Every structure is written in C-alpha cells, then in structure tokens.
Amino acid sequence: QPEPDMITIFIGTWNMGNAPPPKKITSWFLSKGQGKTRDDSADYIPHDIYVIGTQEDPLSEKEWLEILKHSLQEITSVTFKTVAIHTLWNIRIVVLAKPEHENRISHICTDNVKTGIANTLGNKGAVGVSFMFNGTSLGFVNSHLTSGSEKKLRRNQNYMNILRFLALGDKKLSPFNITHRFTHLFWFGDLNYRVDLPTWEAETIIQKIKQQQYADLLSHDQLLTERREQKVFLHFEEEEITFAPTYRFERLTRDKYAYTKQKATGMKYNLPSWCDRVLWKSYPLVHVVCQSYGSTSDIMTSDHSPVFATFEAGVTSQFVSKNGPGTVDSQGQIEFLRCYATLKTKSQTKFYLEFHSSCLESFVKSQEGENEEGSEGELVVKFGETLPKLKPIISDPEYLLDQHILISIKSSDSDESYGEGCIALRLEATETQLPIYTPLTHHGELTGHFQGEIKLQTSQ
Ligand SMILES: CC(=O)N1CCN(c2ccc(Cl)cc2)CC1
C-alpha cells in the first residue's frame, strides 16, 4: 500500500450558542450551504482528517463524540478513529481520522491557553492539537476570542497570547512558537471580528446581505483590515469569503439577523459579522489548496451558522535510508553564502543563528555575525560565508528537496531569539548558488529579514 503524497482535511468551526445541535448536521461535514461548497459527486468520499472546533459547546465530550462519529458514519460508511479531544470551558477541538491512518499518526499533543486577566479571565481562549502524519507535522488551533465590535485590539492581544503560550509540536524547536512548528497550521474558531460600520447602517447591511453583495461589507471586516495593517495573523492565508455573515441570527430560522441592543447583549449592537473563520499557514512551497469555504444554511440551533473549510495538503513519507536516520549521509550538504539578517531592534548585542530541521541530527549554532549599520537606521548582521555546512541525515533528493530549515537569530548576551523564519529546500537547482529569503518574526510580529544564497548538494 503506497504512502499518500496528498491528504484532505476538513476544518469545522461552530459557536453552538450553549444549545444542543439539531438531529442532522451532515450538511456541515459535506461543505453544503453558502460560499465555496464541495461538489455533490464527492459526498461519499471521506476526508482523511476531520478537525471540529466548537465554542459555547454545552455538550459533554462523550455526547459530542457520539454525534460526530455517527454523522460521519452516516455520510461515508466509515467509523472514524478519535485522534484527540481537548476542552477548555466551552471551547472544544475534536480530531477524527480514517482508520487506515491510525499507524501514520504519532506525537499527538493537546494544549489550551486562557486569555484575559481577572475580569477578562474566565471564558475566552484556545484549544489545540498537533501530531505527525508520516513525515508531515500538522497543528490545529480553535480559538474563541474577545466579543464586541469595539474590542478588535483585545482580539489581536488574545491572538498573540495564544501563539506565544500554546505548547504544541516538537518542544526541541524551543525558539519557535506554533507559527513555525508545523508543515501546515490551521487556525479557526469564533475569532469575533466584526463588520465595522455605523449602527444606523444595520438595515442597509441586511439589505446588502439579502442581495449577496458582500464587497462593501468585507471592506469593513475587522479581521481583513487588521491583517492588511499587519496587526494580526501575519503570514496567514484565508480563502475569499463568498457566504453571508454567520452572526448574529435569530435561532430556529436563518431569515433574520438579531442585531439590536438588548440586556442580554450588555446593551451592545451585534451588526451582521463574519465572526467564524478558518485561516492557515503552511511552510513555503508546500502544496495546500482550499477546496471549500462556506457556511451551512440548515443548522439553526445557534445564533451562529457553522463554517466549513476543506484543504488538499501535501504530506511526505517517513523516509529511511542505509545511512540516516541514525547517522549523516556524506553525499548531502546545505551551504549558505553572502547571508545577512536585517533586524528592527534598536539594541546593540552580538547575534548568532540557530538552524533547526528534522533533516539534521540536531540543531546547529553558527559563529556570531558582524553587525553593521544599514543606510536607513537598521541593524544588519553579516554572516558572509562564515555559516556552517549543514549535514543532512539523508541525501536522497526525493527526501531533501521536501525539507525546511527553521532559522532563529539569537542574542549572544541573552540567548533570546530576536526573530524566526523558515527556508524551503524545494530549490530550482542543486549544486547551484540560489537566492533564499524569509521574513523574521518574534511573538508573530515582523522583527526583520534573512536573505542570502543557498547551495544544496544531494546524491543526484
Ligand atoms: C500509546 C497510546 O496510547 N496512544 C494514544 C493515541 N494514539 C492514536 C494514534 C492514532 C490515532 Cl488515529 C488515534 C490514536 C497513539 C498513542
């Protein structure tokens, strides 16, 4: 049986509004309703992995597992295996996989982050799951962020606390947060970003929704505008939104948005909004294609509609050679030429590089670079031709060109990372000097740039 080079992943996010679901929710797992929907011809074809994120979920893990497994069995005739389930308060993530993937899945991690202090600590945060699928690392985050049109800054803060403190993936990758630990990272949930228009425009907004004219609404979506100003979800992607706002509905219909202020809303308006979202971040030059992004029309127990997204995602096999794993393969090497880091830091310490990759037996520390002043105030750390020669465990190009090198630039004084990035080894040529580039981030904020040239030697 050949190992897959592609899998499909279902992502669901649903704020259940503390109500039990209706008896049928199959439309969710089938990507049927509004937006980018899945072809009817695919309805009996199971996804490889289903990742279900709920918020305001009133169910026990057992009650939800029963409904999810029975739903997928009715659709696919497959009894899915439970990879992981993790609940923080009423925030839940479930990961289900086809039985044939049981022995492809390992290194399962779960964690949660609680956001807010005192007042604001008590019900918002995130749950996450990671695991290996053969040679590919996968991370999944379900977050319920701060509510309210006037709290987009709080939401961005919630996001930064979640990506700093969620402890998923390989702990040996210690300079790296979850935005660098995975081949593919999927971040979804009730992110609670709103359509930022005046309250007096509520009926206009509804009119525009009834005409399926979303352009003028999405131009005011706080998540899109905050992402465009690099305030949140830097280097993440989201499929174009072609479905109606998923919040806030009157329960037991989809014919009405409930937007007016009420005691039950803390006297806040809830203008129709895309609260419920799916974003992703994959390593450079890895196959990932969104095949669906939409909302259901026929699940009305909550004041939110469920959101689905599906993805084709590139995966690799668990590679074994005569040499590595367990030794180096002298026929392989990774060399860096003319490398320099540009950092935004106002500080003056020496810096060195750390290279981390599963193609190395362990992480490599470079010599300190030479600090120079850039022509516009910046710190430029020059490595020149001084960076070590990296010794991959396997030289076969079918393995090595599919790998990535994570880079941290660290203070000699503190050994704290000032930036993190990632370089694909999917080069246009081997044994050829080629340009490489990554932005550098710390706590998911832009801190600099790493560029230079690479020279990759494989066994071919
Ligand atoms: C030794 C042990 O108890 N575990 C628990 C979780 N295991 C698991 C792997 C794949 C799938 Cl689909 C489901 C579950 C592996 C490790």
Swiss-Prot record:
GO annotation terms (biological process): apoptotic process; determination of adult lifespan; immunoglobulin mediated immune response; intracellular signal transduction; negative regulation of B cell proliferation; negative regulation of bone resorption; negative regulation of interleukin-6 production; negative regulation of monocyte differentiation
Q: Which GO terms describe its molecular function?
A: inositol-1,3,4,5-tetrakisphosphate 5-phosphatase activity; inositol-polyphosphate 5-phosphatase activity; phosphatidylinositol-3,4,5-trisphosphate 3-phosphatase activity; phosphatidylinositol-3,4,5-trisphosphate 5-phosphatase activity; phosphatidylinositol-4,5-bisphosphate 5-phosphatase activity; SH3 domain binding
* Family of this protein: Belongs to the inositol 1,4,5-trisphosphate 5-phosphatase family.
Instruction: List the range of the whole protein covered here.
Output: 398 to 857 of 1189
Q: What does this protein do?
A: Phosphatidylinositol (PtdIns) phosphatase that specifically hydrolyzes the 5-phosphate of phosphatidylinositol-3,4,5-trisphosphate (PtdIns(3,4,5)P3) to produce PtdIns(3,4)P2, thereby negatively regulating the PI3K (phosphoinositide 3-kinase) pathways. Able also to hydrolyzes the 5-phosphate of phosphatidylinositol-4,5-bisphosphate (PtdIns(4,5)P3) and inositol 1,3,4,5-tetrakisphosphate. Acts as a negative regulator of B-cell antigen receptor signaling.
Localisation per UniProt entry: Cytoplasm; Cell membrane; Membrane raft; Cytoplasm, Cytoskeleton
The gene coding this protein:
INPP5D
List keywords of the entry alphabetically: Apoptosis, Cell membrane, Cytoplasm, Cytoskeleton, Hydrolase, Immunity, Lipid metabolism, Membrane, Phosphoprotein, Repeat, SH2 domain, SH3-binding
One cellular component term (GO) for this entry is:
cytosol
Q: In which tissues is it expressed?
A: Specifically expressed in immune and hematopoietic cells. Expressed in bone marrow and blood cells. Levels vary considerably within this compartment. Present in at least 74% of immature CD34+ cells, whereas within the more mature population of CD33+ cells, it is present in only 10% of cells. Present in the majority of T-cells, while it is present in a minority of B-cells (at protein level).
- Posttranslational mods: Tyrosine phosphorylated by the members of the SRC family after exposure to a diverse array of extracellular stimuli such as cytokines, growth factors, antibodies, chemokines, integrin ligands and hypertonic and oxidative stress. Phosphorylated upon IgG receptor FCGR2B-binding.
This protein's species is Homo sapiens
**Is Transmembrane among the key words of this record?**
no
The organism sits in which domain of life?
A: Eukaryota
Instruction: Cite the domain annotation text.
Output: The SH2 domain interacts with tyrosine phosphorylated forms of proteins such as SHC1 or PTPN11/SHP-2. It competes with that of GRB2 for binding to phosphorylated SHC1 to inhibit the Ras pathway. It is also required for tyrosine phosphorylation. The NPXY sequence motif found in many tyrosine-phosphorylated proteins is required for the specific binding of the PID domain.
- Its recorded name reads Phosphatidylinositol 3,4,5-trisphosphate 5-phosphatase 1
Q: What is the effect of changing V288E?
A: In one patient with acute myeloid leukemya; somatic mutation
What does the annotation say about its assembly with partners? Interacts with tyrosine phosphorylated form of SHC1. Interacts with tyrosine phosphorylated form of DOK1. Interacts with tyrosine phosphorylated form of DOK3. Interacts with tyrosine phosphorylated form of SLAMF1/CD150. Interacts with PTPN11 in response to IL-3. Interacts with receptor EPOR. Interacts with receptors MS4A2/FCER1B and FCER1G. Interacts with receptors FCGR2B and FCGR3. Interacts with receptor FCGR2A, leading to regulate gene expression during the phagocytic process. Interacts with GRB2. Interacts with PLCG1. Interacts with tyrosine kinases SRC and TEC. Interacts with c-Met/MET.
